[PDB]
Point group: C3
Chain length 211, copies 3
Amino acid sequence: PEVATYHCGDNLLESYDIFASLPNTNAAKVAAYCRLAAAGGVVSGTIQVTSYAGRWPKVGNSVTDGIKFAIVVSPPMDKDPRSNLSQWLGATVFPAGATTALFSPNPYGSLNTITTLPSIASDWYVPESNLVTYTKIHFKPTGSQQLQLASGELVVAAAKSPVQTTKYELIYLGFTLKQNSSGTNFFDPNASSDLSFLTPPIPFTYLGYYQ
Amino acid sequence: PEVATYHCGDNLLESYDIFASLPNTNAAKVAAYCRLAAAGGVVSGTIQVTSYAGRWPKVGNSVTDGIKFAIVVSPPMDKDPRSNLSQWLGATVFPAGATTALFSPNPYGSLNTITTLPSIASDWYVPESNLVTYTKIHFKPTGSQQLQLASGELVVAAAKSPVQTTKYELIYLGFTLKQNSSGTNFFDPNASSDLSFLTPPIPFTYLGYYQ
Amino acid sequence: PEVATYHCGDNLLESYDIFASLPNTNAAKVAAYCRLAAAGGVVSGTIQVTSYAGRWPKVGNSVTDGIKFAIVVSPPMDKDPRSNLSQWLGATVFPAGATTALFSPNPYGSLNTITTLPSIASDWYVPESNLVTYTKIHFKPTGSQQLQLASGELVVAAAKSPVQTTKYELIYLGFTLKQNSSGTNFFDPNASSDLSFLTPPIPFTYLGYYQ
């Protein structure tokens, strides 16, 4: 197809289905929506993610450490179900029947630049310094006023997991949200459970499959 | 339409028609051209802007403060004329009859991430620290040699104004140009009126409307 | 054409045909691959590059200075052969017969923002500070472990060379790869000749020709 699209998650961002991996063998559920558009072998899209303190583990200091978490967008999960590391409920491809391969990072591009994720499909956070390669986007998230969120960074990395049955590449999306020094600790067990962060749809571009 | 385009402004950058809001209640006229391409609900485009010191307020010091201004791209101005905060002299859509909705920031993504602009249509500058969310783009503009222009940042934020009659989202483009320390002050009342800056066409991507 | 594509180079990154220009009248051969997709007058694409120390100059310090080089993508080389500063073996456009003009930076945009490269076909590196305008993209390359490659910047600038026979605009790609402070010096005369670096496919967006 000339233009193909892919989407997954909840565009209303009220259903907290999506498994995010967090630093130091932690995890949290988020709500997230990803939309991708592939044309000519190049893919641009967006990712948007929200979550609230009630869902988050109570270790570290968010003000000094950042609010850090990752999700995996897994185009080949329709043929490679164990690739679904973030436990998306489903994904939609237009035109119907178009190959999800259009949305995997390019096979030639990914050779020697891909990150192999830790096996445990419930502990695959990879710190930016350990990602093999990435593209970095700068944005500003919003959230509860006492969090004093100032800025964020998204890294976009080609990835695979040994749990997979195919060679199709996945998309690792690592987030770091940064607060001003006056912000409250999102990780404090006494923090209000309803404190939340919410990103805009953050854009990215990558090379996909094509002939 | 599989691919739709939107454009507005003067690609010759000779008509100083466009209203830019500036910090601390100020404003300035600029020349500008925006071109957007929507495919699969994702829009990629460019903005390019130029002005000169004769159009600019003469307060402060550009070397220390930066040269900062904001313009609004308003796709729904065809159905919401009050949304034309930057006073564009129309826009052109291809294919003819395609809806300008395609170019508004997505309503699902914009919910809780949109910035509501100051209500007077002649003073709606928002400092980056007060935008709700944005994507940030890094670039370098050119201009008169003596300004020693070195770099630039563009924030792209979904925005709305209470003056609007429709619920369609706008695009707030906030610019900060940075000079080397030895550059001359753009804001000096005795500086030459012909001193000028000119951005490249700076690219950006965002989530539009789709079915 | 509604969507058009352009590619050049070796997607296997095994053929070191491509001429990269380096600071201080140096040069190095690299293997590289570029893919571009044009829709609506807006072009998105990627560049990916690899090389090894045996091929690089043996003065300076890469840890202090960075690994800096430039590649030119030259869409009009089908009708302006002297424009092929990076000595690509050729390029491929789809649909067949589509003009390579689609992939040249926009002429109205390129006025007064374009960099005029040095007049020498084998010596056209321009430091970031001396580029007229650009957009900057943040990524992370990989390479030999001992280099400790940490990050990279790509600057994308519209360019022309005095050696050209046409007015069709070229794309200057300037790279800076950044190492941690304990990495080995890629330029040390006694560096292992096999030390290498490899970027991901780094995406960029620009305005092309359109009607």
